[PDB]
Ligand SMILES: O=C(O)C[C@@H](SC/C=N/O)C(=O)O
């Protein structure tokens with residue numbers, strides 16, 4: 001299977017890929033697993049210090065560890081990913097406020113950060129919204145839309161698991177329920193996107209494996225953020241996504257209709273326009289309750305800044321692919 | 326913080342509790358974590374061979390590891406819990422099937438197992454249904470009902486996390502949505518039970534920590550099964566609970582109304598009578614697809630039998646406590 005860990009690892013011409021493979025064996029010893037964790041940590045350190053090959057190598061290995069679908073190795077894979085996450089977060093630039101911002105000041109900082117970094121301001125977004133994109137160019141856009149959308153519900157579920165307050169788990173459960181099609185699994189949002197992809201000649205593969213480095217970096221970061229033990233990381237990515245999807249999707253919907261798509265064909269984008277603003281308003285209380293905590297504020301803001309960095313490098317790479325077709 | 330891991334460990338007169346504490350430290354080394362794992366596995370092995378003190382020790386530590394609420398230590402706690410689970414599973418009388426049973430023989434064996442040991446036939450259940458229980462004795466019953474209900478949704482979420490198929494994750498999402506109150510979190514099933522609990526004088530403590538050995542055994546086993554990498558373990562526990570809840574809760578509902586509180590206060594039991602039956606028919610498909618796989622059948626039936634042994638010993642202990650008042 002294409003999105004299992006071991007087939008992906010055999011395809012990486014890296015020695016650490018074989019050490020990781022040994023660490024994921026059914027009878028792997030603690031020493032093999034600690035060896036994998038140390039060599040992964042050193043690879044990530046070398047890559048984050050400026051070694052372009054170690055940088056690419058650890059990002060590919062981290063993609064395999066964090067996002068493969070062979071559930072038998074999942075617990076050890078998540079253990080190994082943590083060895084890499086620890087290194088990454090030491091290199092990330094951390095927000096270090098010592099005193100908590102006011103709730104009003106905090107929301108305004110978010111609004112400002114969004115206005116400065118929103119995916120909606122990217123030249124590619126504006127260009128498609130303009131109607132000037134070719135059909136093959138929309139296909140580039142939707143090919144990568146598939147990778148962003150199709151397993152988002154799993155990252156949300158990792159955050160659900162880490163919210164110990166029953167009311168906060170419930171808010172995330174309502175999100176997951178909406179995201180998985182409510183009472184009809186034929187209408188889960190991954191399948192709505194699949195219906196749109198098929199309307200424009202693309203396959204929606206639930207075992208899709210990305211080969212674009214910036215997309216891998218985006219998916220790796222998002223999973224790390226939603227899985228973090230300090231939920232400020234995950235609430236940052238979750239909530240910024242909830243705030244940006246409605247207007248972005250309203251313009252993407254219009255662009256697809258302009259591009260020769262039906263209302264039903266473009267339903268994936270249509271349903272978020274109306275489903276999200278109410279839910280986003282109720283989900284805000286998860287952030288409001290934690291604002292007095294300066295550790296939460298620093299985790300949230302560091303998460304947000306890191307998310308924006310990888311999202312921008314990713315949109316830039318999609319934009320380049322779109323221009324070459 | 327009464328149900329966080331470190332405060333619980335400092336209150337355990339078990340030597341290995343200190344080693345576990347060291348393993349959960351912010352900067353714990355691989356040696357300290359691996360050491361803790363080794364001592365926990367040895368303690369479990371001694372306990373399952375008959376050392377009652379080692380048995381009690383491994384069960385209290387496993388309770389702290391698997392069910393404490395400080396998410397900062399959860400990943401390492403779940404890692405250490407695995408070392409105990411592997412030992413436990415070597416001692417479980419597993420259905421040794423060499424080849425897969427037919428669907429016909431699988432459902433028949435399932436029906437037979439449920440017929441022989443369902444919780445509904447336990448003398449305490451028929452006694453409660455009988456009307457004859459005193460208020461103090463119903464308090465005993467509901468005090469332990471709290472421990473079974475108040476974090477069940479978390480165990481189901483771990484199973485959701487391990488269901489890689491999007492339509493099957495959707496099925497578990499429909500379950501969680503219902504269990505956490507659909508659009509209204511004040512109606513989540515833990516809070517409905519908490520309201521039933523407020524009537525009669527009992528506290529519903531979201532940080533409750535059990536000190537009843539058979540109850541610890543029940544919660545430990547259930548979390549292990551729902552977290553297992555082979556989803557047969559969790560599907561076994563999940564499905565046996567969904568199938569028995571409607572009849573059991575129907576009879577408990579009528580008995581509680583006959584004990585003098587309204588239908589609405591006892592809403593926790595009524596809602597299951599109608600809510601669960603339609604969802605159980607769709608949830609069966611997750612099991613039907615896997616019947617042909619003998620590895621699934623062996624996990625499922627081993628889990629069912631282990632769940633019934635632990636459920637029966639727990640119900641026995643509640644019944645003894647109930648008869649002491
Ligand atoms: O990549 C991301 O995280 C943003 C997704 S949001 C789709 C679903 N929203 O509920 C996108 O590309 O639109």
Ligand SMILES: O=C(O)C[C@@H](SC/C=N\O)C(=O)O
Pocket residue numbers: 470473474477504514515566570
């Ligand atoms: O874990 C158990 O023993 C089963 C629970 S069912 C609660 C289900 N939804 O609220 C019980 O004891 O009634």
Ligand SMILES: [Fe+3]
Pocket residue numbers: 179189272
């Ligand atoms: Fe969505």
Ligand SMILES: [Fe+3]
Pocket residue numbers: 504514597
């Ligand atoms: Fe329920």
